[PDB]
Amino acid sequence: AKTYTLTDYLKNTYRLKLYSLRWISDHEYLYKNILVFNAEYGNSSVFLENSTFDEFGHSINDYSISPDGQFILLEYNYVKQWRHSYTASYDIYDLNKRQLITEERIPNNTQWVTWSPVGHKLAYVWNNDIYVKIEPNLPSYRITWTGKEDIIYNGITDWVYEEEVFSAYSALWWSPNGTFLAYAQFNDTEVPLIEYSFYSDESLQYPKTVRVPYPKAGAVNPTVKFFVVNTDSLSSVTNATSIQITAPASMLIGDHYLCDVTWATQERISLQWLRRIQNYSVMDICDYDESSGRWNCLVARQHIEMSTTGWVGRFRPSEPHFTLDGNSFYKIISNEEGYRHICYFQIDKKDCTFITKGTWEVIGIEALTSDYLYYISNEYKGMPGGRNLYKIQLSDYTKVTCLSCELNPERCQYYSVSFSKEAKYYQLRCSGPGLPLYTLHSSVNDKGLRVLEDNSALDKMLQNVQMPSKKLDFIILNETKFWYQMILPPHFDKSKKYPLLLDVYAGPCSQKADTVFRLNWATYLASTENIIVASFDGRGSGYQGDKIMHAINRRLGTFEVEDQIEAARQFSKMGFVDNKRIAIWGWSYGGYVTSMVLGSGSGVFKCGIAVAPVSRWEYYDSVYTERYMGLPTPEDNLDHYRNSTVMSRAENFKQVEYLLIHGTADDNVHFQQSAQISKALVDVGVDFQAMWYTDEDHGIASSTAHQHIYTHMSHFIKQCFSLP
Template sequence: MNQTASVSHQIECQPAKDSKEFVDVSPPQRNWKGIAISLLVIVVVCSLITMSVVVLTPLEVPGSSKSRLTVADLYKPEFSIHDPEATWISDSEVVYRNRDGHVIKFNFALNETEVILSNNTFVAFKVAKYSLSADLKYALFAYDVKQMYRYSYTASYIVYNIYTREVWELNPPEVQNAVLQHAAWGRQGQQLIYIFENNIYYQADVRSISLRITSSGMEGVIFNGLPDWLYEEEILRSHLAHWWSPDGERLAFLTIDDTQVPNMALAQFTGSTYPRGLQYPYPMAGQTNPAVKLSVVNLFGATHTQELQPPDQLRHRDFYVTMVKWISNTHVAVRWLSRPQNASLMTVCDATLGACLQRHEESSETWLSRQTQEPLFSKDRSRFFLALPVKQGGQGDFHHVTMFTKKIRSDQDEVRHLTSGDWDVTKIVAYDENNQIVYFLSTEDSAQQRHLYSVSTLGLFPRRCLTCGLKEGCMFFDADASPDAQHAILHCKGPGVPALLLLSFDNVDSYFILENNLPLRSALETKRTIQTDIRIITNDNFELPLKLIYPPDFSESYLYGLLLIVGSSPGDQTVTEEFSLDWNWVLVGSEQVIVARLDGRGSGFRGQRVLQQVHLRLGTVDAEDQIAALEYLVKLPFIDRTRVGVFGEDYGGFLTLMMLKSTERLIRCAAAQAPVIDWSMYASAFSERYFGLPSTEENRYQASKVLPNLKGLQGGTLFLAHGTADANVHFQHSAELIKHLIKIGANYTMQIYPDEGHFLSKRSRIQLTHSLIGYFRGCLLDASSLLSQQRDDE
């Protein structure tokens, strides 16, 4: 939209000065009539010029003097969200790192703070990550951190005495300058655990000799206490595969054997004359999966390792271990999931004997979601709680708090549902056994929000919302309860600037603020404000939330380009009240483009009926919903239907390409980052969850392939971006796509990031951001037209 500046271009009119005539020396005969006419003409001309400037200059609106958000702003410290990483160390104490970099212990019962570590210490040792021993006498500092996959990393570590400032390296016996895969404190005193070359090492305290717990570890083959790629990315969603008992006397850990799993090669093109390669186990759909076993080692006294056996139903079949949680000092809850992911069993195992008893069984005709969910048990283990799908009339199944209580003189449990309604319980936070209260997060107020609620396990199960209206700008919360379930660390995630609060359940009218991100709030106040709007559209009898982000000074009298950003994974939720600050804000704020996001079928937290619509048909109904959103949006009076773009990453990139196959001339430009083009070439646990095995569902896999009938963009250029060392979505996918585009003669532009993984480096992210904005600017940013002018032309 072209605008004229209002002050700098104004023309100032001044009276014309009298001029003297030197030719005729006789007394002048003034033509008063002519002078009057001339002055009148000058006044009229000046008035017309002034009027034209005023008419062509938009009205000054509040905030228009503020600057626009830039790509450089996104990477400035003042525009970052500070996460204090607050953790409970007792019922009334938390430890966190403040914005100045100091590690603080806060006792909120006494309202006292104490500096444990100063930021100077972090700077002196170039600390990237830290942790404190249970007795708060020592710190573990990680430096030279190198990211592996989504969660995992390697690092070197030093042990630091907080009181004497003594320092020494953490190394396995007879090894110097070791690079460790993990190091952390235990539950008691100064217990230490670290993992080196896929084996677990244990120290009873900082001065003790290291004891090697396992010896079977082999690089890229057998993993002890750590997940392989599949378990890290798709099963546990964590870089850890070991769990401390509450008293620190025992350690449960997985041993993952990838001996029979096919390897994937990632070429390393730079840094040497001949390209090198990295191989790692990566089972694609239908290929051999890793074998896994769960063991418990006794760390006090004579070291003894006990293997926990899977249920008989799964013993001779492929299965996953998706959840391990200690529910007492000697008992551990374990969830075992079948390879098709449609049946699971939860057992409670006695770690001293190795005996396991089944406590819960779950099955589905499609697939089971939330299999990493941890149960909450009573102290005597007779009662436990889970959030499970419960049928809610014609609306289908929604997750609700379910209470299992062991019957007297029976192996059966009494089952009661403490909540109900067409909304989801997203997380059970805590169980206050003394007061018989369960605390949980849910979408009861809105599917786009998260609030903390309490519900009694007695009577008619009365519940109340503890965070509704708690703080302005806070409608999306996460929560971590104190050990005694009397307090919670609240993570306010939006829609306003995120904050970290401390709330006592017995006084929900007041709270402590641990972090308010004031620098971010102040920085945003210097920028022009964008607007957001969430509305509901309907497609195929499904109500789907659609979020629109409008430019500053949005007016329905103008035409805007449209960019639809497609979600990155089934089960995710992109239309929420969470705060976010990313590159599409720059596009909206500076390029006069409207950005849209839709949660279509297959998205999460709106019931199982919506989620499981994509079973056996990824790339069909989910793509149809995104197309329906575009068709709805281009009918709006302020959207220019000739300027429509789509962007997606991973699964979103897959959907973007599938949409191109189904629409003609609706999409003018499209960008896909690391797109999946064939689910048979993706991870077994993911692809089989939605399609089953290729051997039995080959037609489903064929129907979801991107390349058949893909014609590219009519009259446009497809934008692709991919790292060559992507361990999640291999560059193989983009290579096959490019080969097809060349074959059919379609135009494309490619951004390659040599030796970069799925998660690009900061420099590459900045470069990609500039490239994406430049690409969509060329496509979506035409001179804005007034609707009235368009109607006059018509």
């Protein structure tokens, strides 16, 4: 008789239980007490007691066991930087001796730490330089002497590489047996700085000015170098010698990126490079030479990947999966029909043969063994929004087994997977449409060992609450399927008219209509406020082939915007939608599209909310922006850069109720972007509503800020919909 309230969402009354494991062998894995588990039986017992480090003094944020299990690294003093980057203090614990190591310790304010893949070698980054420890208690060797704050990054990424290329702070790649440590070096000397105020605590008298080298569209980019150093032959008397691997000649002719690093074998590494115009990428295969101690990347072994219709990869070229001998690999590339499928490449020839095909896409290669290739795709039922684990037989490609399709077809249609070190076991994670379900399997016969978490605890509670449902479906548009989803209020009556809120992202390769179960803001709006919240994947959206995804190439703020308006038009004709009460909201790219929609003059939407929106593409970073827009120069794409601003649509905002929200310490979509929107609206005399968030960044993710923002939006929406 009670509903899922805003408070329920904000305080997580109804917790979604996870089951996070970290494999350590081919049949064992860890689980947070921190106990070990057996995939076979489930026996053993404990690894570390709930409070053995009670007498540490500091509060432990995370742990990391060495591969051989002889040492555990303890992380504390965590200071977040950007999305993936941060700073921490570290101590190492000898698991055998049962004592904290106190000689030659890892320094304070360490940027990144990593074990070698086998054994207990250690590499860390401090003050933008790389250090190596053969043994946890011996003096570390300094690898690099060039690291300078905001200027040179050794073994760590700068702003743009962090956010837009590697989705990681780390730029260190150990060879499979720990012999070689490969790293990248970024140079930002000439990359312009973004500056913004950070007000900080009330005690701070004068505001701090934050500075980060951040390349906006068409600006000077960071340059990148790639090195490889031999850790087995490290000298405590002479400096470490780093062999450089230069980019291919087809890359060195202009600005370029390093977009992938993947070790093939103990003495072979693959590198992928991307031109600044992101429609051409090359893969180098580099072997270690013992006569010279150098690395050779045969020009004949280069593999080219390009696109005539758009950019390469979903957000970057796919990563290769090497056969053990490293003379072959599989990777996802789009076929001649434009659908992303798995291609098999032989190291010493031009042609690859495709091993999957059809009008659906492979999402990822999960593991490869001697006999089988494992991958997740949206093939099941032609639904782009589902995800199932498949097995393909290497000796015969037509022999394909769906390992998750029928495990529970009603409650489970969206899977991810985690395989053991050698793929003998795998954990399946099901994310919807029913409550999440975590199961454990043996890959020898593909039967299920046991249920790891079934979420019945949560299921019991949701029995008493009036919950919304999800409709997943498509509309036909120009002889093409476009998918949408709806969070429908409980006791849904299709003869009554409901206010509708369009929830938008709609960036390139986005997908907002899927089979995932979520407890979120939409959930409360549906449950308590009886609002329908819909999402739509129009042109530019992903996992439906290049025809749809590349439709907005060089033309951002066009078709994907038009299609959201059309979706709304379509939902009005569904009969149960009150077309005097349609609203639209989105974050980031979604804030942009919401703003573009509201300023289009369509008359379809009464109101909207844009959170941290891009307002004009020259303000956003090069890597993301240029992938879709090219350069903002007269000989490239300036005209569309100038045409696709939200500012230029300010006059049409007179027709709608607008709320614009932005965190003042947004390193990503700079406050600048909203500042220019508000200025344009003021300049044409449009009244609207605003909210800044002091020192909040792109996430607006502080516990209190998070609560304030969703509360503020609730009132705005409820006000727009005449809801008390």
